[PDB]
Design a protein around this nucleic acid. Structure first.
Ligand SMILES: [Mg+2]
Ligand SMILES: [Mg+2]
Ligand SMILES: [Mg+2]
Ligand SMILES: [Mg+2]
Ligand SMILES: [Mg+2]
Ligand SMILES: [Mg+2]
Ligand SMILES: [Mg+2]
Ligand SMILES: [Mg+2]
Ligand SMILES: [Mg+2]
Ligand SMILES: [Mg+2]
Ligand SMILES: [Mg+2]
Ligand SMILES: [Mg+2]
Ligand SMILES: [Mg+2]
Ligand SMILES: [Mg+2]
Ligand SMILES: [Mg+2]
Ligand SMILES: [Mg+2]
Ligand SMILES: [Mg+2]
Ligand SMILES: [Mg+2]
Lengths: 88, 116, 70, 100, 65, 271
RNA sequence: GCGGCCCCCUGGACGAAGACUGACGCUCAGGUGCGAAAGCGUGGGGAGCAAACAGGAUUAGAUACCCUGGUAGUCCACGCCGUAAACGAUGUCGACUUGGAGGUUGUGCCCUUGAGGCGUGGCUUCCGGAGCUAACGCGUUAAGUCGACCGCCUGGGGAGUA
């Protein structure tokens, strides 16, 4: 679940600073690292209905952030979705 | 015959009967006597007295085997649970130890349905 | 409830010792519980009522402790 | 790097075998950059209940820190080994030097 | 009473059988916390320790095996 | 993967296909093929002995290696091939020295997997080794009966045999039929459980689907005439007789086993 | 809805001290998803219990209660069903308004000098104050004083039926 070394490394790439955790790019890039990591978990344990509600919350919390970012800064939004790969 | 020295008394108490079997230490039975077959047919074999009578009767039938010492192993609930122990002393046996063996599942097999 | 008859006792003492062990091990109470199936819903209601009366009587005696009858 | 508290019992008539196998497991544990902190040999003990008869057994404590993939191989060597009964693999952290 | 497993703070383990034998009746049944006094945070650590040692045959499941 | 065919035709309504993509799609291995001419149920005398056999697609016998007496010499599975003769897919196996052979495919064997034979082998699905060495309670297949005979038990698709208990020089196996049978402990037995476990779930859907597997039509006795079959006769569907085979001996209940020389090894009759 | 112990993968909650984003929030018709037990389909498994069924009793009768047996089912895999007194008969989110005695899980300070004392948070069971209510009762976890959004009701039967 995004071990410290793997979660303090995403903050460095996407954060404007090295100590900036919480920027919309960082938050969405952190969430995307978990939605793309649980795909292999749920492709084996299909009946894990209780852990899927956690995944369906990380998915929606990301879309809520993207809509805020897109309205606030279109240029920054269209650059994040291609640096990451989504909106399909 | 075989004049065994140390035997084990197996009491099978229940809510409807009381079966007493006296065996040697290797688990080979020698004699037995129940409550219902001892002239206590009906609502009387449950009583803690019919267990006493059968315990004396089962204390017999090993007279030929010359038993002097005993270990009492009480199984099941019921009225014939204690009255049938002292009846073995009344026959002269020397009780070595009293072990309660009772099948208690650790939430295993499902019991029957409730009566109404 | 294994008890070993120790040295030089009267029988009634050793027998009354073994009975104390059966009462303390609760073997008789356990068997009477396991003779019939109690539905899972009837157990929860039977436990709750056996923790309410325990509480309600506990308050009742204190609530009646500060009273003079005559 | 996950800690472990592997403890297993062997056949009583293999007590001379254990020195041979305790080092083989430690060699395999160390062979994959794995540490080991406590190697207490409890000796021969009397069982509380008989398991497949065998009123006695010989206990070994390992307290190994190994990668998650090495242990799964080690449990297999515990299973198919006829002279290992009741292997237990706990997951813990930390310390050393207890129980003797 | 309540002092054990709460004074001298520790996390109970299943090796010290001499300690655990003070928390089981003669038949191997775990004594309830009401009788002893151990706090609930530690009876769970003392219930799981006894069940852990039973599997290793360090303690008896029952008094007749 | 059982896929139900869409009902574009009355005769494709009910077909269910068991399609396995992992099988090889080309041609088999030439040096391990033979000629397999058909019979139709006809022995030396030329008279049919077993009825309802005839026709069907032409096939070729693929020499499957059953003894597995090449000890050591690890081998790699190259591909899984469809075998018309058996009910389980076979696997081409290449040994280290350069010799290719065929084996029955276990349930968890794919290309690139490694197997090997011999007493030294390890307990792994696909590895064969004498039953004296396989831990009791295990699930095995391709069991033998006599040391070196070749392998005769649990050879169909999805079929296996349990090693219930080992007693001295003889091993008690729970077979697939429900029997418990003693076999000599030295018989090799390939560890695992045979593949193609979905072979049951296929249905043929039409009459020709069974006609092109060498299965001729089966005619009931009650339709026959009294000369041709004991049931026979009648004016309008009369039976009135205890069912029997066309040769008099009773069917539907009557036991026929009689060996008296291998009843030592039958611990418990089939339940 | 979840109760033996162990490992593998995994979701949520809470607490102390900080750093960061800067209204990114609440509710939600349609829609989608999860949803006890019984029930259905295919393939297994079947110890115990037990609809149906058989016999014995009770009875005026007893196609039930009681007794002796017992199949489906209860169990596993994958699909379907989508209903319960699915209940605290009480929608979700937020603010404000006297107390007491407990449970459970965190944390801070000081004579932990010794089963201590004083605080602050999360969840939770019981009693009661104003207030509310037809009454019973609820009573900081409101059924009190308010704000936003949704669902539902409009005499009984016919009927949650055609
Ligand atoms: Mg009964
Ligand atoms: Mg036919
Ligand atoms: Mg005709
Ligand atoms: Mg004829
Ligand atoms: Mg006619
Ligand atoms: Mg007729
Ligand atoms: Mg809706
Ligand atoms: Mg169901
Ligand atoms: Mg079913
Ligand atoms: Mg079935
Ligand atoms: Mg019945
Ligand atoms: Mg409804
Ligand atoms: Mg409910
Ligand atoms: Mg409602
Ligand atoms: Mg909502
Ligand atoms: Mg109140
Ligand atoms: Mg309707
Ligand atoms: Mg309805």
């Amino acid at each position: 679940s995004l071990s410290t070394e793997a979660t303090a490394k995403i903050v460095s790439e996407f954060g404007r600073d090295a100590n900036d955790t919480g920027s919309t790019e960082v938050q969405v890039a952190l969430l995307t690292a978990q939605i793309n990591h649980l795909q292999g978990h749920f492709a084996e344990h299909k009946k894990d209905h209780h852990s899927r509600r956690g995944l369906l919350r990380m998915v929606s919390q990301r879309r809520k952030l993207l809509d805020y970012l897109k309205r606030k800064d279109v240029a920054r939004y269209t650059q994040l979705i291609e640096r990451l790969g989504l909106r399909r | 015959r075989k004049q065994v020295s140390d035997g084990v008394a197996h009491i099978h108490a229940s809510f409807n009967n009381t079966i007493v079997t006296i065996t040697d230490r290797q688990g080979n039975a020698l004699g037995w006597a129940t409550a219902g077959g001892s002239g206590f047919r009906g609502s009387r074999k449950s009583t803690p007295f019919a267990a006493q009578v059968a315990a004396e009767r089962c204390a017999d039938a090993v007279k030929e085997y010359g038993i002097k010492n005993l270990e009492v192993m009480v199984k099941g609930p019921g009225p014939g649970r204690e009255s049938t122990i002292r009846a073995l002393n009344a026959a002269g046996f020397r009780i070595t130890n009293i072990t309660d063996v009772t099948p208690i599942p650790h939430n295993g097999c499902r019991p029957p349905k409730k009566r109404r | 409830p294994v008890i070993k008859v120790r040295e030089n006792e009267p029988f009634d003492v050793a027998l009354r010792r073994f009975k104390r062990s059966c009462e303390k091990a609760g073997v008789l109470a356990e068997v009477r519980r396991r003779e019939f199936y109690e539905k899972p819903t009837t157990e929860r209601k039977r436990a709750k009522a056996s923790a309410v009366k325990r509480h309600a009587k506990k308050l009742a005696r204190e609530n009646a402790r500060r009273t003079r009858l005559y | 790097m996950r800690h472990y508290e592997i403890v297993f019992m062997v056949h009583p008539d293999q007590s001379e075998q254990v020195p041979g196998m305790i080092e083989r497991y430690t060699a395999a544990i160390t062979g994959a950059e794995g540490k080991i902190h406590r190697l207490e040999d409890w000796g021969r003990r009397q069982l509380a209940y008989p398991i497949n008869k065998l009123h006695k057994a010989h206990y070994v404590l390992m307290n190994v820190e190994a990668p998650q993939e090495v242990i799964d191989e080690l449990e297999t060597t515990f299973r198919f080994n006829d002279a290992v009964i009741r292997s237990m693999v706990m997951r813990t952290k930390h310390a050393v030097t207890e129980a003797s | 009473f309540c002092r054990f497993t709460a004074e001298g703070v520790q996390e109970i383990d299943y090796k010290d059988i001499a300690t655990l034998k003070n928390y089981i009746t003669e038949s191997g049944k775990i004594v309830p916390s009401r009788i002893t006094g151990t706090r609930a945070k530690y009876q769970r650590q003392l219930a799981r320790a006894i069940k852990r040692a039973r599997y290793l045959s360090l303690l008896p499941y029952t008094d007749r095996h | 993967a059982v896929v139900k065919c869409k009902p574009t035709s009355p005769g494709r309504r009910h077909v269910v296909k068991v399609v396995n993509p992992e099988l090889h799609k080309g041609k088999p291995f030439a040096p391990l093929l033979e000629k397999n001419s058909k019979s139709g149920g006809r022995n030396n005398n030329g008279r049919i002995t077993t009825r309802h056999i005839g026709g069907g697609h032409k096939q070729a016998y693929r020499i499957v290696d059953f003894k597995r007496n090449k000890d050591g010499i690890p081998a790699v599975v190259e591909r899984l091939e469809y075998d018309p003769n058996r009910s389980a897919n076979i696997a081409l196996v290449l040994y280290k020295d350069g010799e290719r052979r065929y084996i029955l495919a276990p349930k968890g064997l794919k290309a690139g997997d490694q197997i090997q034979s011999g007493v030294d082998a390890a307990i792994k699905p696909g590895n064969t080794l004498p039953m004296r060495n396989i831990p009791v309670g295990s699930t095995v297949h391709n069991v033998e009966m006599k040391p070196g005979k070749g392998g005769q038990l649990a050879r169909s698709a999805g079929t296996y045999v349990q090693i219930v208990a080992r007693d001295g020089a003889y091993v008690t196996l729970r077979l697939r039929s429900g029997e418990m049978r003693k076999v000599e402990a030295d018989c090799r037995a390939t560890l695992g459980e045979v593949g193609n476990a979905e072979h049951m779930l296929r249905v043929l859907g039409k009459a020709g689907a069974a006609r092109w597997r060498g299965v001729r039509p089966t005619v009931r006795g009650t339709a026959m005439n009294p000369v041709d079959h004991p049931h026979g006769g009648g004016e309008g569907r009369n039976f009135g007789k205890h069912p029997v085979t066309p040769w008099g001996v009773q069917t539907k209940g009557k036991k026929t086993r009689s060996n008296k020389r291998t009843d030592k090894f039958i611990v418990r009759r089939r339940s």
